[PDB]
Amino acid sequence: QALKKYTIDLTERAEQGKLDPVIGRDEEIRRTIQVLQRRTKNNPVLIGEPGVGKTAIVEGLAQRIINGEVPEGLKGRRVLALDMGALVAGAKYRGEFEERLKGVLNDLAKQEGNVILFIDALHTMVGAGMDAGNMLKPALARGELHCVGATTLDEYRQYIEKDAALERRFQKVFVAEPSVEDTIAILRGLKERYELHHHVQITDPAIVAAATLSHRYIADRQLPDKAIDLIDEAASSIRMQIDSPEELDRLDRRIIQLKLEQQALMLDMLNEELSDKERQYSELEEEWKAEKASLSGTQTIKAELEQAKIAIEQARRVGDLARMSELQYGKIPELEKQLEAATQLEGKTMRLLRNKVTDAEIAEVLARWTGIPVSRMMESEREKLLRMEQELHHRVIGQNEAVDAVSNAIRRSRAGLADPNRPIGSFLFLGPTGVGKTELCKALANFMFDSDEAMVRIDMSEFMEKHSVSRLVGAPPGYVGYEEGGYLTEAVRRRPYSVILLDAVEKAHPDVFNILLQVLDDGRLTDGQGRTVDFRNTVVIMTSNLGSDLIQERFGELDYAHMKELVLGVVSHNFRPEFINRIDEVVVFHPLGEQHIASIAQIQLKRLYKRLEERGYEIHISDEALKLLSENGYDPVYGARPLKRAIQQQIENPLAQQILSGELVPGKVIRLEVNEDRIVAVQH
Amino acid sequence: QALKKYTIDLTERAEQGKLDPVIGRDEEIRRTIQVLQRRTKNNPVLIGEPGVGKTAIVEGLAQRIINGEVPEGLKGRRVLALDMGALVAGAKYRGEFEERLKGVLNDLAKQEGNVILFIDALHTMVGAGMDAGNMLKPALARGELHCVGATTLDEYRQYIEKDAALERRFQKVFVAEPSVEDTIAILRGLKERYELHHHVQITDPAIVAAATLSHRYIADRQLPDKAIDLIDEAASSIRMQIDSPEELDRLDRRIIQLKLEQQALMLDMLNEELSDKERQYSELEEEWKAEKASLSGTQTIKAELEQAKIAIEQARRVGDLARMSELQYGKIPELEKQLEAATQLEGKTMRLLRNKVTDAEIAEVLARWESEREKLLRMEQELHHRVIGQNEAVDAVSNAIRRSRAGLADPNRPIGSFLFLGPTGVGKTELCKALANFMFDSDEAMVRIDMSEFMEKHSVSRLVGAPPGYVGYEEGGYLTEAVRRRPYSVILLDAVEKAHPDVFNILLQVLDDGRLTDGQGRTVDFRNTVVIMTSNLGSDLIQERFGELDYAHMKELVLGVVSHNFRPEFINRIDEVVVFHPLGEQHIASIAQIQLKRLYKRLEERGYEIHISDEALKLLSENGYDPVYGARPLKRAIQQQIENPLAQQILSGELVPGKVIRLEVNEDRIVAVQH
Ligand SMILES: Nc1ncnc2c1ncn2[C@@H]1O[C@H](COP(=O)(O)OP(=O)(O)OP(O)(O)=S)[C@@H](O)[C@H]1O
Ligand SMILES: Nc1ncnc2c1ncn2[C@@H]1O[C@H](COP(=O)(O)OP(=O)(O)O)[C@@H](O)[C@H]1O
Ligand SMILES: Nc1ncnc2c1ncn2[C@@H]1O[C@H](COP(=O)(O)OP(=O)(O)O)[C@@H](O)[C@H]1O
């Protein structure tokens, strides 16, 4: 024969129950049977992005052939899974490939249409060394084969819409991703399957949270394959933690260590201590065996329940009379209620932990994938949001108003009250140059997701040309950066949960504001390569200096409201009404006071003492030296980077020179005493 | 059956202890035990760079199966290692290979989901002749097979990620290269193995030095394989030096030579000399046999100690009562103390020697294949070797190396920042190449980029990285992209006086943190390099008044001149400003002598012998040296004024070989004569 040599008889497998009873998908099975009951062009192809269960649609079609939900044009049909890889890979020679394939077509035509041929990965058939299309073509035209394809949409439009004859030989059935609730229903059927295998239980809140958080976060793989990945991987982690016991291992190491100690000593007391620890070890071991026996009985009774369900389906196919009522009314409710009695018994007895996969397990598995704070406000990030003013003032002294505004913005977003097409929050930082624009940016990226490195800083001062705009969106096809990628859009597509930091957007060309109009309108910024860039998870922050002299000269005896309205008017003179129209909340910075400069110096002393204690020195400072640093590092035009370069040039250059001179000794208290113009270090 | 015909039971070998004690890798065995117990994707493939013991990760999984340290469902599995190579070519028929593999797969269907299959180099399962992929692509989805793959990343990315009916029956259990201390941990168990085969002793400082030098120097292979091969080859080296001596060879050649002479003379005295040397040879031979007997007894009783350890482990597994305490209290301490007595006895008697493995043996195995002070002294000495002159600059760079390579400076700043001030062509290129030839051990382990061409606005668009679709684009980038090509080198920016303020902004970004991104979004670090610049105005002040002035106030005056020309804060972040003198007579003489050395090497390999006169060297010194260029006019003047009349005369059929070819002078020429 040929058919047993190359194909996989799926109806025999579904008759042996080795498949998945996939719930739903009723319209796609209907449209596949609409195609398969035609006269010519009997060839549906199942098209969708991978993971959506096109193989499962074919297997569910086979299960409906076996049970008999099909019309009277498919009953008794066999479904055979041709393996396109299993015909190419023997052909060394001229015409041994076509030998096999003509053998397959003669045996299927001997069956006389009684065999629905199934071909998975149909885009292997076309380019496989003329080969396989130009023999199947006279059979696919006359309907004497019954091919069912299964392919990704990209391989469809690449390997078939090219070759138009084999395009019209087939027929599309567009398969869409399932919904969230359909994903939940699918996973409920698959829970009822999977708890036979991993010997555990699954609580349906973990199922719905798994589906929702997988749809929220995993943006490469698609439903339901990613949800099944999460559920199965958590089931395997719990199958580990059945036999992971740690306390028995600690007690065994303790008793063998005290055994070696007592055997070396042969005052004693250790016969008594070892007897107590052996008694505790035996009790924990017997409790462990009791838990194992409980889980074994629960698994066996769950397996007998599922075999009873399979047997009552056997009675639904065959048609025994008393067997139906007997199996149902006896076997289903009593086995379910003592399955729940075993469930509450395991809830009583599992001290040595879980057999029920909770949502925290899903959080641990998805955190091992990516690392998001996946779950909700867990009173650690939530109290962080309740002290988000304090959390931002942990690193950024001063500028209370913008801290409050950004805190309110993220408090709106994490509660789900943002308009979910816009990005998380637009910001127009104003005011004096170099106070903590970038420090608030770093602190925001820090206490948003990870750290200061989950950002993209873009100097907008460099973009002053038309081809600069074509750079930062991406060059259109047939041109240059279309080879070598866009600028902004690639930086977003690498870091999808990030912060975009612009720098002096007023120094940019007067048209990049229109790209920002698209950004702050809807957060899709279609690049040069024609694929969308999704800003709905990010935070766009823009910095400027359009009223730095205006704010520094009028901060005295003017409140926050008049300052905001005045700088709104001035920015309206500079910018356009559309651009400031799309902004969520323009904040206004104020100039710095000398106590804030002293606080910046304090934080620099904190980080410098940390670095030099990692180096190995114990250094103290007089506050007079702090006052000299504060007076030598502020100006109305530059701000606190004068303090930074003053700290660098007056500490980091001379004191490290004194260290490298073999002068200073690690461990000594090093008081940074003052000079007339400098700071001297002593060894005391 | 066919399992006996084509598989390798790992569990029987670990059952009889033939395999290796797997050390570490708890996490990867954990991830393997996860992926082995799922319902889908039930086939891991251990993926990493090759030779990191992926086979032994499977073997340690098998050992934990035998020792019961696995979860409950794995308790009772069988690990079988199917060879891709064992199956191939018993076939003249049209697929006898396929028949045998079908018989194996039916046997694994008969074993009913128990046998866990091992295959390494899973790409060979994909293409080897249906051959092994699509005979098993059913069995890799029908639950009758639990294969454990093992391959490199490249074969996974090609031959498995593509094949979409195979792509989701496999997970990437990533196995990384173990660290130095991890490799130490792996070696500390197999040291027990690697003495019982080679009859020697291994010491732990040699092990950590071997791991350190292996990770530092051998870069073809990786850890832990290369450290293990160093240990095993050192064991072979000591096995050779014990089993095979030198003075015995000298004495044997001497006695057979004097035996030849005495047999010839048949005055004598040689009967007496030969008898003395034969007595000495017999004494050394008997001492050598005594040493060999001592080492034989030592290693036999060491193997007895190890078999006592194996026997007390057998008594731990079985549970005999008197055997445990008997084997412990008898067999361990007396055999250990007389093994140490044999060790100190060999320390007394081995003269004719070595039985241990030391770090000197590690150096020997590395050569037949320690950092800061030695590298400091070798750096300074090679500075005095290659580049002539500029000993002040030698000391300046040596001071900067002593300041930066102590580690007590900022690791967020670039290492070497300088300004070469002096006339051109004096050896600035030579100094850069000597820096490169020590610090990265090649002359072109560096980057030379001139800055004199970048006076216009097209400097950041030509040095850093161009906008898309303009002049400086299709070479990549001058400065930034060379570091992406060579992250391990030294950077030069000659003629920085012709710069542009964007370049000064770039260099302040360099001297701040070293990170710098081009116009298309690639973050490039500079801190692992050395950046050097040049100017030629205070150099003209040097050419004016280097004589009768010092070096330090010279440095202060030229730093003031640079402060006139450059920004003070721009040159403030520079580590050290150096001064280059005009080399005048003796260094010109030396570099001309170097050019004469390479000329003499080529003319000696022709077969001549040429001696220069010092007067002709003075003519070359006066004709080639100039105050504006240095010595590249001296190079072409050497080329012309020597080689062209010389090659004129040699091809004249004139200068006979084998004579002193004296470079005398004419009134204006440099002529060679024959006498
Ligand atoms: N409705 C469903 N009910 C139950 N399981 C499903 C359902 N749809 C998909 N699955 C499961 O999803 C997994 C694979 O889904 P598929 O859609 O078959 O992925 P796929 O068909 O292999 O797609 P590609 O392109 O071949 S990767 C199997 O474990 C199926 O059981
Ligand atoms: N409120 C603050 N708290 C702590 N440190 C700050 C604060 N404001 C500024 N700094 C320091 O001041 C400097 C300002 O630099 P930057 O923010 O880059 O310039 P600009 O203020 O023009 O945006 C930063 O380098 C930062 O170290
Ligand atoms: N746990 C371990 N401890 C020490 N050495 C190991 C360990 N595991 C493997 N090795 C070494 O790795 C070598 C095998 O390399 P392997 O990883 O099997 O090959 P490949 O390069 O094909 O992945 C063996 O010589 C073994 O000594």
Q: Which residue of B has its CA nearest to A613?
A: B408
For residue A156, CA distances in Å to A47, A167, B159, B163, B318 come to: 8, 9, 21, 16, 63
Residues in chain A within 8 Å Cβ distance of B520: 471, 481, 484-485, 487
- B468–chain A Cβ distance below 8 A for any pair: yes
Ligand 2 contacts CB of residue A644 (under 6 A): yes
User: Which among B628, B450, B433 is positioned nearest to B534, based on CA atoms?
Assistant: B450
DSSP string for A540-561 = EEEE--TTHHHHHHH-TT--HH
Cβ pair A588, A564 in contact under 8 A: yes
Q: Which residues of chain A are within 8 Å of residue B38 when distances are taken between CB atoms?
A: 232-233, 235-236
Q: What is the DSSP letter of B275?
A: H
Q: Answer whether B658 touches A (CB < 8 Å).
A: no
From B403, which residue of chain A is nearest by alpha-carbon distance? A660
Q: Could you give the angle at the alpha carbon of B87 between the alpha carbons of B83 and B93, nearest 5°?
A: 170
Among B130, B410, B572, the strongest candidate for a mutation testing the A interface, having the largest count of A CBs within 10 A, is B130
Amino acid (1-letter code) at residue B257: Q
Residues of B in contact with A462 (CB under 8 A): 519
Sign of dihedral through CA atoms A89, A92, A93, A94? positive
Q: In whole angstroms, what is the distance from residue A509 CA to residue A529 CA?
A: 23
The dihedral through the CA atoms of A342, A343, A344, A348 has a sign that is positive
Task: Give A25's contacts (C-beta < 8 A, 6+ positions apart).
Answer: A53, A56, A57, A60
- Which A residues, 269 through 308, put their C-beta within 8 Å of a C-beta on chain B? 292
Which residues, at least 6 apart from A80, have a Cβ–Cβ distance to it below 8 Å? A3, A7, A8, A9, A10, A108, A115, A116, A117, A118
Inter-chain contact B469–A490, Cβ cutoff 8 Å?
Answer: no
Q: Sign of the CA dihedral A280, A282, A284, A287?
A: negative
Of B40, B467, B469, the CB nearest to A232: B40
Give the integer Cα–Cα distance in Å for B116 and B95.
26
Rounded distance, CA A354 to CA A199, Å? Answer: 11
Q: Are B538 and B558 in contact (CB under 8 A)?
A: yes
Assign 3-class secondary structure to B307-367. HHHHHHHHHHHHCCHHHHHHHHHHHHHHHHHHHHHHHHHHHHHCCCCCCCCCHHHHHHHHH
Q: Which atom of ligand 2 is nearest to the CA of A641?
A: 13
**What is the distance between the alpha carbons of residues A104 and A88, in angstroms, rounded to a whole number?**
13
Residue A177: count of CB within 10 angstroms of its CB: 16
| Residues in chain B closer than 8 A to A369 (CB atoms) | none
- Element counts in chain A: helices (H) and strands (E): 31, 16
Cα(B255)–Cα(B276) distance, integer angstroms: 10
Q: What are the b/e assignments for A80-92, b being 16+ CB within 10 Å?
A: bbbbbbbbbbbbe
Would you give the DSSP letter of residue A124? Answer: G
Residue A682 three-state SS: coil
* Neighboring chain A residues of B165 at a CB cutoff of 8 Å: 83, 85, 120-121
B45 lines ligand 3 (CB under 6 A): no
DSSP-derived secondary structure letter, A436: S
Atom of ligand 3 nearest to the CA of B51: 21
- DSSP bridge pairs for B143: none
CB contact under 8 A, A86 and B40: no
| A155 → chain B, closest CA residue | B164
Protein residue whose Cα sits closest to atom 24 of ligand 1: A50
Q: In terms of CA atoms, which chain B residue is nearest residue A487? A: B520
User: ∠B602-B607-B612 over CA atoms, to 5°?
Assistant: 65
Give the pair of three-digit tokens for residue B2.
């066919």
Atom 3 of ligand 2, residue of closest alpha carbon? A396
**Are B46 and B29 in contact, with CB atoms under 8 Å apart?**
no
End-to-end CA distance of chain B: give it in Å, rounded: 92
Q: What's the B553 CA to ligand 2 centre distance in angstroms?
A: 39
Cα of A441 from ligand 2 centre, angstroms = 10
- The letter for the amino acid at B253 is R
* Ligand 1 in reach of A22 Cβ (< 6 A): yes
Inter-residue contact A108 to A140 (CB < 8 Å): no
- Supply the DSSP symbol for A636: T
CB-ligand 2 contact for A169 (6 Å cutoff): no
Residue nearest to atom 10 of ligand 1 (CA): A53
B163 touches chain A (CB under 8 A): yes
Q: How far apart are CA A120 and CA A45, in angstroms?
A: 10
Q: Give the 3-state secondary structure of residue A591.
A: coil
The answer to whether residues B520 and B465 touch, using CB atoms and an 8 Å cutoff, is yes
| Nearest chain B CA: its distance from A264 CA (Å) | 10
Q: How far apart are CA A187 and CA A196, in angstroms?
A: 14
Minimal Cα–Cα distance from B411 to chain A, Å? 11
In angstroms, rounded to a whole number, what is the distance separating the alpha carbons of residues B198 and A575?
A: 82
Task: Give B71's contacts in chain A (Cβ within 8 Å).
Answer: 239-240, 242-244
Q: Which residue from B257, B289, B288, B282 is spatially nearest to B270, judged by alpha carbons? A: B257
> Any CB–CB contact under 8 A between A466 and chain B?
no
Report yes or no: B23 and B60 within 8 Å, Cβ to Cβ: no
Q: Which residues of B touch A50 (CB under 8 A)?
A: 164
Distance of alpha carbon B22 from alpha carbon B440, whole angstroms: 38
**A89 → closest Cβ in B134, B403, B408:** B134
Atom of ligand 1 nearest to the CA of A49: 25
Structure tokens at B400: 């900067």
Tokens of B561: 């001149």
Report CA-CA distances (Å) from A58 to A53, A120, A315, A399, B552.
Answer: 9, 10, 25, 62, 87
3-state secondary structure (DSSP) of residue A569: helix
Say what the resolution is, in angstroms. Answer: 4.0
Nearest alpha-carbon partner for B414 in B529, B570, B491, B506: B529
Q: How far apart are CA B141 and CA B111, in angstroms?
A: 17
Q: Is B285 in the pocket of ligand 3 (CB under 6 A)?
A: no
Interface of A with B in 21-50 (CB under 8 A): 50
Rg (CA), chain A: 35
Phi/psi at A665 (5° precision)? -115, 130
Ligand 3 centroid–CA B101 distance in Å is: 28
In sequence order, which residues have a C-beta less than 8 Å from that of residue A320 and are 6 or more positions away? none
Tokens of A203: 């609580």
Residue in B409, B469, B521 closest to A487 by CB: B521
CB pairs under 8 A between A and B: 111
Nearest to B368 by CA among B249, B222, B234: B234
